[PDB]
Design a binder for these strands. Structure first.
Ligand SMILES: [Mg+2]
Ligand SMILES: [Mg+2]
Ligand SMILES: [Mg+2]
Ligand SMILES: [Mg+2]
Length: 1341
RNA sequence: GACGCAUAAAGAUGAGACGCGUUUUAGAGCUAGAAAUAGCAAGUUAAAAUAAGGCUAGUCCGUUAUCAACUUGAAAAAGUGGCACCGAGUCGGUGCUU
DNA sequence: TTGTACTGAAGCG
DNA sequence: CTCTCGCTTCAGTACAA
DNA sequence: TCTCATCTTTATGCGTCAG
């Protein structure tokens, strides 16, 4: 009658088991459909479902964003062509048509094969005159001669297409604020304002600073040594205040007009001219030098004065490359002529031919040429250029991502200012072209859709087409920026129909502090027992303490209030240790800004303050903050307004305004905050207030409050989890359906939840500030002295990593700066192409170019050699972990490899936690569907959440050991053990049922005590319990309920039953059959080949001319039974085989299958015998061999090896020989057990041999591994067991893979023939596999 | 087993952008050559595409979830499969039942 | 002319 | 006043019929 | 890889949800 269901939810697996009250698993004769002769099969109610992962959406977002960027770039080019078209019609009416036709072969081209001029001599004259586009760009900016309009369009289209980045927002005018000369007019301006007119000697310019690196410790000493120091922090010339601003907002030093805070001159300095701009020169010239140092950092030098330093530097690279190429060729032909063919012709050995024509990247070319370079003579300058990575450089390079768009804009403005006299239409629409280059869609606007995108939120004032010139007249920036946030912030969970408060909201802070405060309790010598703080006390301490310190300590709560006001000798307190968890931080911010305490303490003006804080949270864009805030300008002075608009906030609370201050109790009239301020002597907190039935909040919340697919579709987060949710809920539903719709007595879920010692918990959850502090004092730096910081800004990951690395890059020996992390790179050690891992152990803050060059690799052996000492210096200083040092040093151990792809990855754990939590909620909501007027829910089925630790301990303590490498049955056995342990546990201790059952509750560090209890609770299974003192204690071999005489656990029959179930051969393993989504092919384009297999990259682009893709992903296979017109003497041969349908043909095939099959050559197709076959389709063959359909032309291992449990226990015990960590008598017990049962190894090998001969058929691998075993038989038991544990890779279900046994590696046998399953028996397995439909394919055709 | 707060890890989801990479063409290769070729010279850049494409034609969308078989239903979605016992190499056997 | 067996390929910071 | 988490299919080239 | 915001699940400290 009664039955229980146990569940184990892995990220890729759902173990399931059904048990009775006797801990026995039922077995039933299930009906089997299909045309086969089998009508009934006996199966056991235990199994697991295996499925491929749920994939995250973010890759699809990346493709979406790349698609959008390409479309918008094409539209920019189209806009420029639309502007130039009418003038282009005058000189060459087919110019854009030849540019559009550049990709076609000359036979396909409608016009002449030369795109630019249409004739060969002018084209070769162009390339001789301008070797690169940069030469043409420089000629257009610098010269004044009327040039051809085609060249003008080519330069502007090149520079618009590759416009550089927008991470600089200012003007950065690369035309006067640029020449290193600027120091001279700076020192004159300094002599003109500073009336003493000091020394203006011919000292060396900022090139002296830039000779090594831009830093404090060298700039300051160089300028002070060059020109004698009259004022160290007030030199008023080329200061660090005028180069790289200070970390804090510290006041001006030796001020001229006023003492005002200082920062860097990017975007937070334009109001620190309040010394003069608020009271009405060197700051302007300073800005111009700051610009000069940025652009001389990002571009090297122009010796002759040009408006285009970029093009000049690129031509400098070209000329250097040409000279060094000529020198290299001459020296190579001189000293080693035999290498000349390899270096300069063979493009496959990473030579110069491989560096240009081949695929070798710049670092590979350098490391190839370097030994050849050093063995040669006269190569000192080539080698020092190689060491600077400045040898034979290209122009188009990964380094160019450093370049801000302002440089390209400056060049465009200069070119247009040159050529506007010769072409009036350039002067007519110069601003339109500048807008085409400069315009960027704001991130808060999103896509520019018209009601046809699920991703778009932008609203528009008019229906006109959006152009960069009319963007502000059409797009309603306001509502769109608000809709960027409000669509995305979650609703209040108690009031589902309105949004939560901002985190920094004053009302939210008030609620938070009064909620914490109202269950503070205090006691003192006159008391009988502790009291709560009355409302007047709570108000007085809020006024005198919280409003006067940004945080409060219980120590000052004593020594400030209780000693002075209502004086006590002592008071003892509970509800708080040390720091209060709440504070009025925003109140202190607003007090510091408005400087009106009475305004903030005023009651009637709270709503406008909440409107302000809401505004300052929602909006980032300064003009939008201004516009929204402007309404309140008749209470605030313009100064304090222009200040307050800086005070950005972010993040959101959990509650609506109406919950905490909107709803009122009908009889009291008080809000929740009103009760928290004063509730007499009850002082009820929030939870009490929403669950006390006396107040009228409870039924108001109740009044504030179907398909399964809707129930999973509404909830947010990763789409990945929804797969798992649907799978296991469908499993549970079909298990209920199998046994005649009878509901379980309970469902047991293995939650991935734990408990641990309080000390360990706090030791983990420490503030990262303490970590930074103790590491930096351990390594003895002074970074905190010069750069001070507290915890909350380390929540930013770049600044955290900057303090983690002690202000210095560990790839390159240079100091880092704190103000310029914008262009600095976060870097993952392991490539994101290889393995998703976003732990701090895998993250680097490094200079951009170094990470860019570290494409697809761990840091290479050379940077390891350069930096391993500093890496060790940070390792022993507790700033990086051993995993971080091992990852950093990974190149010395061979770099990444297949065995580095092993070990379970962090995300799987978070996924299983999320998945199981949701599963538990949906199963409780679905199963308990009935309720009464007095009973709010009827516990028809108790969902019981076991912690993993309990079942894992039960496994070890009774030697039901588990390993994974042998078979997938471990999932099913874990589910069965969860069912057993949970059912026995709740049977033994009914008074603990309210702990484990979902939705129920009962009412030295607390976690410590709970963990110790969570150990002791399991003891009732044991026969003998060893206490902490080392003395044994007995326990009856029959267990009873205690309050009842009902037996709960017999240490006889029940252990035998468990061992019998664990040793059962028949376990249901079902791989979910899935039809493939995702990308059409592998993404790489492949060269022109006469091969038919090349997928056409475009409709007209025949890939036999143009190249194409390869490896088209098969969406699914289809069985076809038809005639294929075979032979020279043509005749119709009837034949049956699988066709693969690729994703590209999925929609075309499903539109009309018969016509698509006739397009493939099949005729007389039997339409009704077309079978849809997903991946992993299951086929049953002779002798009991099972083959899994991996693809239209590949099979997979479909059987599973049911090894006896004694061998599994012996294998687990033989490995991990000295790492059990129990007690010594136990380890020696297992040592004589494994020594006396050594022959089990041979028995296991015999089993593996039979099973391999039965279903694997890889006989060549079989005899190879048998010879390897017979060679290595005399090795110690440890390595033999370990390598045999590897050996089971031969026999697992699914994909063949390589494995190695001791010294020797075995390659997989590949089942590359799907002909042989065409006469097998196809199996349609249900979600559990208990329901089957076996079809015989030999009877078809 | 839930909720608010602080302190933690480890992860998600959407938008705006940058630089590379690859492909085809353009950038006249020269000499000795019956030549299969051999010697020499040169190589740095540009145009275009970047899931085929789709229609509501937007400077939008097209790689994330949804998926055993059969019977209904456009689809959504609904429905379809006896029990007890003795045993165990991927499940077998025995006995009642319509 | 068609199956095998073996080695190699794969968009990224 | 209630407790005792997982791992590949296709592209090529070279031989057996 | 850069810039923007938004969540989610587990760990520990505080408080609380019932009869
Ligand atoms: Mg588990
Ligand atoms: Mg998927
Ligand atoms: Mg990296
Ligand atoms: Mg499992």
């Amino acid at each position: 009658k009664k039955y229980s269901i146990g569940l184990d939810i892995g990220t890729n697996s759902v173990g399931w088991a059904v048990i009775t009250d006797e801990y026995k698993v039922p077995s039933k004769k299930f009906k089997v459909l299909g045309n086969t002769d089998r009508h009934s099969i006996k199966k056991n109610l235990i199994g697991a479902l295996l499925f491929d992962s749920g994939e995250t959406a973010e890759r699809t977002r990346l493709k979406r964003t790349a698609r959008r960027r390409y479309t918008r770039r094409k539209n920019r080019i189209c806009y420029l062509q639309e502007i130039f078209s009418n003038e282009m019609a005058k000189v060459d009416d087919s110019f854009f048509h030849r540019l559009e036709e550049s990709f076609l072969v000359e036979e396909d081209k409608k016009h002449e094969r030369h795109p630019i001029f249409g004739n060969i001599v002018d084209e070769v004259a162009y390339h001789e005159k301008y070797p690169t586009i940069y030469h043409l760009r420089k000629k257009l900016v610098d010269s004044t001669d009327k040039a051809d309009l085609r060249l003008i369009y080519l330069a502007l289209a090149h520079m618009i297409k590759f416009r550089g980045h927008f991470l600089i927002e200012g003007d950065l005018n690369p035309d006067n604020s640029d020449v290193d000369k600027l120091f001279i007019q700076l020192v004159q301006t300094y002599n003109q304002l500073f009336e003493e007119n000091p020394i203006n000697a011919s000292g060396v310019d900022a090139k002296a600073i830039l000779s090594a690196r831009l830093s404090k410790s060298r700039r300051l000493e160089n300028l002070i040594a060059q020109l004698p120091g009259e004022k160290k922090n007030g030199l008023f010339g080329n200061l660090i205040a005028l180069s790289l601003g200070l970390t804090p907002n510290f006041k001006s030093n030796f001020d001229l007009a006023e003492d005002a805070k200082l920062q860097l001159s990017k975007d937070t300095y334009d109001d620190d001219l309040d010394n003069l701009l608020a009271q009405i020169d060197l700051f302007l010239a300073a800005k111009n030098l700051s610009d000069a140092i940025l652009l001389s950092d990002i571009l090297r030098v122009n010796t002759e004065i040009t408006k285009a330093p970029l093009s000049a530097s690129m031509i400098k690279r070209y000329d250097e490359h040409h000279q060094d190429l000529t020198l290299l060729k001459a020296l190579v032909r001189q000293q080693l002529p035999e290498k000349y063919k390899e270096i300069f012709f063979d493009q496959s050995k990473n030579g110069y031919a491989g560096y240009i024509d081949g695929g070798a990247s710049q670092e590979e070319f350098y490391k190839f040429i370097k030994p050849i370079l050093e063995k040669m003579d006269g190569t000192e300058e080539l080698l020092v250029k190689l060491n600077r990575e400045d040898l034979l450089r290209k122009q188009r390079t990964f380094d160019n991502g450093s370049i801000p768009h302002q440089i390209h804009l400056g060049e465009l403005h200069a070119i247009l200012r040159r050529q506007e006299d010769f072409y009036p239409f350039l002067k007519d629409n110069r601003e339109k072209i500048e807008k085409i280059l400069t315009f960027r869609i704001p991130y808060y606007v999103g896509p520019l859709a018209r009601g046809n995108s699920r991703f778009a939120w932008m609203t528009r004032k008019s229906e006109e087409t959006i152009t960069p010139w009319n963007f502000e007249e059409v797009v309603d920036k306001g509502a769109s920026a608000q809709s960027f946030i409000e669509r995305m912030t979650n609703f209040d969970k108690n009031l589902p129909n309105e949004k939560v408060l901002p985190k920094h909201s004053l009302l939210y802070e008030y609620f938070t502090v009064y909620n914490e405060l109202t269950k503070v309790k205090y006691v003192t010598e006159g008391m009988r027992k502790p009291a709560f703080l009355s409302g007047e006390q709570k108000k007085a301490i809020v006024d005198l303490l919280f409003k006067t310190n940004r945080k409060v300590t219980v120590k000052q709560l004593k020594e400030d209030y209780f000693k002075k006001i209502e004086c006590f000798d002592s008071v003892e307190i509970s509800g708080v240790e040390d720091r209060f968890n709440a504070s009025l931080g925003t109140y202190h911010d607003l007090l510091k800004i408005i400087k009106d305490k009475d305004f903030l303490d005023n009651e009637e003006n709270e709503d406008i303050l909440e409107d302000i804080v809401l505004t300052l949270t929602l909006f980032e864009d300064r003009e939008m903050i201004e516009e929204r805030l402007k309404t309140y300008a008749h209470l605030f002075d313009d100064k304090v307004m222009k200040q307050l608009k800086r005070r950005r906030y972010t993040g959101w609370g959990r509650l609506s305004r109406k919950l905490i201050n909107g709803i009122r109790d009908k009889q009291s009239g008080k809000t929740i905050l009103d009760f928290l301020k004063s509730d007499g002597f009850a002082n009820r907190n929030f939870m009490q207030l929403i669950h006390d039935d006396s107040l009228t909040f409870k039924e108001d919340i109740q009044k504030a409050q179907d398909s399964l697919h809707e129930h999973i579709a509404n909830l947010a987060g990763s789409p990945a989890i929804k797969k798992g949710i649907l799978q296991t809920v469908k499993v549970v539903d079909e298990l209920v359906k199998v046994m005649g719709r009878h509901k379980p007595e309970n469902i047991v879920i293995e939650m991935a939840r734990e408990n641990q010692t309080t000390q360990k918990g706090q030791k983990n959850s420490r503030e990262r500030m303490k970590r930074i502090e103790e590491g930096i004092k351990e390594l003895g730096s002074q970074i905190l002295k010069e750069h001070p910081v507290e915890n909350t800004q380390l929540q930013n990951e770049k600044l955290y990593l900057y303090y983690l690395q002690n202000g210095r890059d560990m790839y390159v020996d240079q100091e880092l700066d704190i103000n310029r992390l914008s262009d600095y790179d976060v870097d993952h050690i392991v490539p994101q192409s290889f393995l998703k891992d976003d732990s701090i152990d895998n993250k680097v803050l490094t200079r951009s170019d170094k990470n860019r060059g570290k494409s697809d690799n761990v840091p290479s052996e050379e940077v390891v050699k350069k930096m391993k000492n500093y890496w060790r210096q940070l390792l022993n200083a507790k700033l990086i972990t051993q995993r971080k040092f091992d990852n950093l040093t990974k190149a010395e151990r061979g770099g990444l490899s297949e065995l580095d792809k092993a070990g379970f990855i962090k995300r799987q754990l978070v996924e299983t936690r999320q998945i199981t939590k949701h599963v538990a909620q949906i199963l409780d909501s679905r199963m308990n569907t009935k309720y009464d007027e007095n009973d709010k829910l009827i516990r028809e089925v108790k969902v019981i959440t076991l912690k993993s630790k309990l079942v894992s301990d039960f496994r070890k303590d009774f030697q039901f050991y588990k390993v994974r490498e042998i078979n997938n049955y471990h999932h099913a056995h874990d589910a069965y053990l969860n069912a057993v342990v949970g059912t026995a546990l709740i049977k033994k201790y009914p008074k603990l049922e309210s702990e484990f059952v979902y939705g129920d509750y009962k009412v030295i560090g607390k976690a410590t005590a709970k963990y110790f209890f969570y150990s002791n609770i399991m003891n009732f299974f044991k026969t003998e319990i060893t206490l902490a003192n080392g003395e044994i204690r007995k326990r009856p071999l029959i267990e009873t309920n205690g309050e009842t005489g009902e037996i709960v656990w017999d240490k006889g029959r029940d252990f035998a039953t468990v061992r019998k179930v664990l040793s059962m051969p028949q376990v249901n393993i079902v791989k979910k059959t899935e039809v493939q989504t995702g990308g059409f092919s592998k993404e790489s384009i492949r060269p022109k080949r006469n091969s038919d297999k090349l997928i056409a990259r475009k409709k007209d682009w025949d890939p036999k001319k143009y190249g194409g893709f390869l490896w088209p992903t098969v969406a699914y296979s289809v069985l076809v039974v038809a005639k294929v017109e075979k032979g020279k003497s043509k005749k119709l041969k009837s034949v049956k085989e699988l066709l693969g349908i690729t994703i590209m043909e999925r929609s075309s095939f499903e539109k009309n299958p018969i016509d698509f099959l006739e397009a493939k050559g099949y005729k007389e197709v039997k339409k009704d015998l077309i079978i849809k076959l997903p991946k992993y389709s299951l086929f049953e063959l002779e002798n009991g061999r099972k083959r899994m359909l991996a693809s239209a032309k590949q099979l997979q291992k479909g059987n599973e090896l049911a090894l006896p449990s004694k061998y599994v226990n012996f294998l687990y015990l033989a490995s991990h020989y000295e790492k059990l960590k129990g007690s010594p008598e136990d380890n020696e017990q297992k040592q004589l057990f494994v020594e006396q049962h050594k022959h089990y190894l041979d028995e296991i090998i015999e089993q593996i041999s039979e099973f391999s001969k039965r279903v694997i058929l890889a006989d060549a691998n079989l005899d190879k591994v048998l010879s390897a075993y017979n060679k290595h038989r005399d090795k110690p038991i440890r390595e033999q067991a370990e390598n045999i544990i590897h050996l089971f890779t031969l026999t697992r279900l699914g994909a063949p893979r390589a494995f190695k046994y001791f010294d020797t590696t075995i390659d997989p046998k590949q089942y590359r023939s799907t002909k042989e399953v065409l006469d097998a028996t196809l199996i349609h397995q249900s979600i559990t596999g208990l329901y089957e439909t076996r079809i015989d394919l030999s009877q078809l055709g």
